[PDB]
């Protein structure tokens, strides 16, 4: 529960780590287990370098449409304001 | 700016003055301040409430 | 209405609410806040 | 199940049938208070403080002398555990003052970031803390002090350094300040990242976050709540 | 203390110049800037008896100017007297930082890409002075701004039609709401 | 360049009783009559008409009958009752046209600045509009033939002039003024959505029969030049109104801010004085 | 292309229109004088923006295969009309 919470908390919202912060936060300098991390979580083992991805967040815009779903909300919203006085 | 002869934003970093303004929105102002007065009136009806109860 | 477990159970004092928003902050000290001028 | 050992709160977790007409109008209030103490002692901040708040504003009257007072001392223990509480003095009965001689200095120790005072209030008032009997407060109140520090200073500066806040709150090393900032990202208060060479935080605040479509998301709940209370006043207008 | 026509010296005024001190010591806080020019520019009836006291006039015109090291000077004069005048001793602590932030608001209302150097001209070494000063102005619920260390941002902000004026209605009428609701729940049983 | 007129259905009840005549006189199935009136502006009003005894051969369909015993001396009658309400046009039923309509128009065009063949609706079940107008047109072509005269769609409505509701709104006995936003809007949603999209099915009738078995006005000059206007926004995936979505946040701005603020005042409106009246009734009923 | 990116770059213009960068501006200001297309052409990115145009003369294969826009429109605005009405169904009232 140290190591899989490292698997979570190694770049939650970090810039980048290197070999030495792996050596500090992780332990056992290099097994095939941090190599297994780099080949098991969908990871880019950069040039003596680390990144979560090329954008770390999978580019959030969420749809680029906040309008029509709240228009359906307006449908049932006006509907509930109807039938009542 | 502090005497409202000049409506905008100066700079020191990039040295770019930018004039713009849009103060009045009564849709916000008049409505919400009259609701504040409404809530004061409902607090004034809270004693009709506390009088019919006890 | 006492029906629960409980039958076993602004002079200087509302100024103390802003003063306990101030108690960890600059009691008076007046010299410090007057001698921060002349050290440069 | 409150006065004795705590085994059968899973019974409420599996058999939650707790919803009558809520008839006596104070029974439901103190009921939500007691189950707020439950969720306070299970583990909760948010839902527990909101049902404590609803029982607080659902105090029926003050027609019974000083009975809100001790029970309120134990009510806002979770708000003390928030760290975002000022001094609580508007509640204070003057006959409660001689019993909150610990509790006044305790919320003063919430406002202060001192460590020796954080344990000297305990060393001074552990017997009244046992009269509370709820050392879940002290098992997280140090963490609350460091979260108060991180909320204040991370709301304060855009690109602070971890060394500034660290050796401003006596952390003495970069890597436990890194674990503080990391578990604060994990606890999700601010964006603050690390310009990773030896620490030295590179970060930002968050204005221009959003302000227009996001209020009208919550305005559905605002006015749907209003129309719920409309129909409730209709079904209450039905009574005469 | 607006009127100032009928209180020359009665048997109740051992010093009308202490009334002049009492009107400046609160007009420097509460009075707005068009109100400031409207009182101590458009009219002189207090300005004769404080033109016998020029540093008071000087401090109010510097308040009208935004020059800040003489705020340190004459505010320190007023704070020496604020310890040495009665009806002030349970109350002086709010005054210092309140007048400071009363200048700091229009200070940030000047512009946005500000620093501590162009302000250190007015402050001296206001570098880690403004650390605790402005940071606890941020943490005292006051002084809407953003501030950075080495990128060194300053921010002036809060247009009034944004969210909180939209918020205050339900802020009243949620506690007020369930208040009147429980007051309408005492009625059944 | 004519938009709309004002229509009194009083002489459309004369169309109704001539629709009672044709059911019991003989072989004439359709109601053909003559539409009096007066050009006032591009907007217009009609006060009277009349209905010709008309026959029309199924063989060589240009066989009209517009008697001048029924035109000239009845025109003297209609001139004697008023000088104002003279000829303005004529009318026949169906929606489409028969062939002889052009010559029936040009017969009484000699009396009028613009005689109009308002094609009328006796058994209304239609999807669009009621009776509609056609003005004299010379559009001929881009080809340059002898001058075209087939009277083009230069539209009309059913306008309401003045009082008459002594009769009409006493004769209602059923209907109600909907305080708009009380399913009146979804009556309109039904009618304009369904009746404009099966008008679009008439358009796919055009754009399928004029593709399979349809020639010369196949791309006349106004099919493609309006497929432009159809090509305002026909796009493929979701049509990407990228400007208009934050601009629609700017739209929904005003609406739901009035919802939040104003409808919270509506909450105050109903709830506070409702609690007053309610609880007063409740315990002061004791 | 019916699709978007109607803030087109000048690149296809200067390649296939046998025109240069200094003359795309004349290419569309002379078209402003023509009056069949009136683009709001970008000039910080040099992009030749597409607004409303005068489309074609005849696309008989697209007069037949405009169903993917016409019947698209018909059944989809019809279906979403049925969906708006179907979510506000029983306030028929």
Short description:
The structure is cut from a larger assembly and holds seven protein chains of seven kinds. Chain B has 54 residues and is mainly alpha-helical.
What does this structure look like?
This is part of a larger assembly, with 7 protein chains of 7 kinds. Helix content of chain B is 52%, strand content 7%. Chain B has 54 residues and is mostly helical. Chain B has a two-stranded antiparallel sheet with strand order 1-2. In chain B, strand 1 and strand 2 form a beta hairpin. The longest helix of chain B is centred in the C-terminal third of the chain and has 28 residues, at 26-53. With 40 residues, chain C is mainly α. Chain C is rod-shaped and about 70 Å long. Chain C is 22% helix and 0% strand. With 240 residues, chain D is mainly α. In chain D, 58% of the residues lie in helices and 2% in strands. Chain D has helices spanning 10-14, 27-42, 46-57, 67-73, 77-80, 97-100, 103-111, 115-132, 136-156, 162-166, 174-186, 213-237, and strands at residues 193-194, 201-202. A two-stranded antiparallel ribbon of chain D has the order 1-2. Chain D is globular and about 75 Å long. Chain G is mainly alpha-helical and 93 residues long. In chain G, 46% of the residues lie in helices and 4% in strands. Chain G has helices at residues 11-16, 24-34, 60-64, 67-87; strands spanning 7-8, 48-49. Chain G has a two-stranded antiparallel sheet. The chains are: A mainly alpha (85), B mainly alpha (54), C mainly alpha (40), D mainly alpha (240), E mainly alpha (189), F mainly alpha (286), G mainly alpha (93). Chains in contact: A-D, A-F, A-G, B-E, B-F, C-D, C-E, D-E, D-F, E-F, F-G. At the F-G interface, helix 5, helix 6 and helix 7 of F face helix 3 and helix 4 of G. Chain G: GO terms for molecular function: structural molecule activity. Chain G: This is 26S proteasome non-ATPase regulatory subunit 13. Chain G: One of its GO terms (biological process) is meiosis I. Chain G: Belongs to the proteasome subunit S11 family. Chain G: It comes from Homo sapiens.
């Amino acid at each position: 529960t140290i190591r899989d919470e490292i698997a979570g908390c190694i770049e939650k919202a970090y810039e980048k780590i290197l070999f030495t912060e792996a050596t500090r936060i992780l332990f056992f300098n290099t097994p095939k287990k941090m190599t297994d991390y780099a080949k098991k979580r969908g990871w880019v083992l950069g040039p003596n370098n680390y990144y979560s991805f090329a954008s770390q967040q999978q580019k959030p815009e969420d749809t680029t449409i906040p309008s029509t779903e709240l228009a359906k909300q307006v449908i049932e919203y006006a509907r509930q304001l109807e039938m009542i006085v | 700016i502090l005497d409202k002869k000049f409506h905008g934003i100066l700079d020191q970093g990039e040295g770019v003055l930018i004039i713009f303004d849009e103060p009045p929105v009564d849709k916000t102002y008049e409505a919400a301040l009259e609701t504040i007065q409404n809530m004061s009136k409902v607090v004034d009806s809270l004693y009709n409430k506390a009088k019919k109860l006890t | 209405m006492s029906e629960k477990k409980q039958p076993v159970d602004e002079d200087n004092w509302d100024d103390d609410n802003v003063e306990d928003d101030f108690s960890n902050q600059l009691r008076a000290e007046l010299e410090k806040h007057g001698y921060k001028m002349e050290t440069s | 199940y409150l006065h004795y050992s705590l085994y059968d709160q899973a019974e409420k977790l599996v058999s939650k049938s707790v919803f009558p007409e809520q008839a006596n109008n104070n029974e439901w209030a103190r009921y939500l208070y007691y189950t707020g103490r439950i969720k306070a002692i299970q583990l909760e901040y948010s839902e527990a403080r909101r049902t404590m708040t609803n029982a607080l504003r659902k105090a029926p009257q003050h027609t019974a002398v000083g009975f809100k007072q001790t029970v309120h001392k134990l009510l806002i223990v979770v708000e003390l555990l928030l760290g975002e509480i000022p001094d609580r003095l508007q509640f204070r009965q003057p006959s409660l003052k001689r019993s909150l001689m610990p509790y006044f200095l305790l919320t003063q120790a919430v406002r202060t970031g001192n460590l020796a005072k954080f344990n000297q209030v305990l060393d001074q008032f552990g017997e009244k803390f046992q009269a509370d009997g709820t050392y879940t407060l002290i098992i997280r109140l140090r963490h609350n002090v460091i979260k108060t520090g991180v909320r204040m200073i991370s709301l304060s500066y855009s690109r602070i350094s971890l060394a500034d806040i660290a050796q401003k709150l006596q952390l003495d090393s970069p890597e436990d300040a890194e674990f503080i900032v990391a578990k604060a990202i994990r606890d999700g208060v601010i964006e603050a990242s690390i310009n990773h060479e030896k620490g030295y935080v590179q970060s930002k605040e968050m204005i221009d976050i959003y302000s227009t479509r996001e209020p009208q998301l919550a305005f559905h709940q605002r006015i749907s709540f209003c129309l719920d209370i409309h129909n409730m006043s209709v079904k209450a207008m039905r009574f005469p | 203390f607006l009127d100032t026509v009928s209180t020359f010296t009665s048997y109740e005024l051992m010093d009308y110049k202490t009334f002049v001190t009492y009107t400046v010591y609160v007009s420097m806080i509460a009075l707005e800037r068009p109100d400031l020019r409207e009182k101590v520019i458009k009219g002189a009836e207090i300005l004769e008896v404080l033109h016998s006291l020029p540093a008071v006039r000087q401090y109010l015109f510097s308040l009208y100017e935004c020059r800040y090291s003489v705020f340190f000077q004459s505010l320190a004069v007023v704070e020496q007297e604020m310890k040495k005048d009665w009806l002030f001793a349970p109350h002086y602590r709010y005054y210092v930082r309140e007048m400071r932030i009363h200048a700091y608001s229009q200070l940030l209302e000047s512009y946005r890409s500000l620093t501590l150097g162009y302000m250190a001209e007015a402050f001296g070494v206001g570098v880690e002075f403004i650390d605790q000063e402005l940071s606890r102005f941020i943490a005292a619920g006051r002084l809407h701004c953003k501030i950075d260390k080495v990128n060194e941002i300053v921010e002036t902000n809060r247009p009034d039609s944004k969210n909180w004026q939209y918020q205050e209605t339900i802020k009243k009428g949620d506690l007020l709401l369930n208040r009147v609701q429980k007051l309408s729940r005492v009625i059944n049983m | 360049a004519v938009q709309k007129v004002v229509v009194h259905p009083l002489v459309l009840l004369s169309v109704v009783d001539h629709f009672n005549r044709i059911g019991k006189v003989g072989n004439q199935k359709r109601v053909v009559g003559v539409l009096l009136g007066s050009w006032q502006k591009k907007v217009l009003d009609v006060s009277n008409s009349f209905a010709v005894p008309f026959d029309e051969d199924d063989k060589d369909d240009s066989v009209w009958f517009l008697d001048h015993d029924y035109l000239e001396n009845m025109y003297g009658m209609f001139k004697k009752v008023n000088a104002r309400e003279r000829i303005v046009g004529w009318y026949h039923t169906g929606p489409k046209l028969h062939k002889n309509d052009i010559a029936i128009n040009e017969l009484m065009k000699r009396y009028c600045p613009n005689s109009v063949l308002v094609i009328i609706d006796v058994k209304p079940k239609d999807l669009g509009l009621p009776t509609e107008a056609y003005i004299s047109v010379e559009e001929v072509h881009d080809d340059g033939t002898p001058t075209s005269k087939t009277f083009e769609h230069v539209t009309s409505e059913i306008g309401a002039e003045e009082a008459e509701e002594v009769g009409v709104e006493h004769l209602l006995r059923d209907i109600k003024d909907t305080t708009v936003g009380t399913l009146s809007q979804r009556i309109t949603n039904q009618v304009h959505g369904l009746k404009g999209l099966n008008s679009k099915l008439l358009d796919i009738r055009s754009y399928l029969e004029k593709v399979a078995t349809g020639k010369l006005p196949i791309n006349h000059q106004i099919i493609y030049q309006l497929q432009d206007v159809f090509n305002l926004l026909p796009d493929v995936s979701l049509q990407e109104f990228v400007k208009a979505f934050y601009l629609k946040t700017n739209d929904q701005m005003v609406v739901v801010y009035l919802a939040s603020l104003i409808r919270s005042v509506v909450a105050l409106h109903n709830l506070i004085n409702n609690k007053i009246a309610n609880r007063d009734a409740e315990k002061k009923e004791g | 292309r019916p699709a978007n990116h109607r803030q087109l770059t000048f690149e296809e213009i200067a390649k296939s229109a046998k025109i240069t960068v200094n003359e795309v501006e004349l290419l569309v200001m002379k078209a402003l004088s023509v009056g069949l297309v009136k683009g709001s052409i970008d000039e910080v990115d040099k992009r030749v923006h597409m607004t409303w145009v005068q489309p074609r003369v005849l696309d008989l294969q697209q007069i037949k295969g405009m169903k993917d826009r016409l019947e698209f429109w018909c059944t989809d605005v019809k279906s979403m009309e049925m969906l708006v009405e179907h979510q506000a169904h029983d306030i028929l009232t």
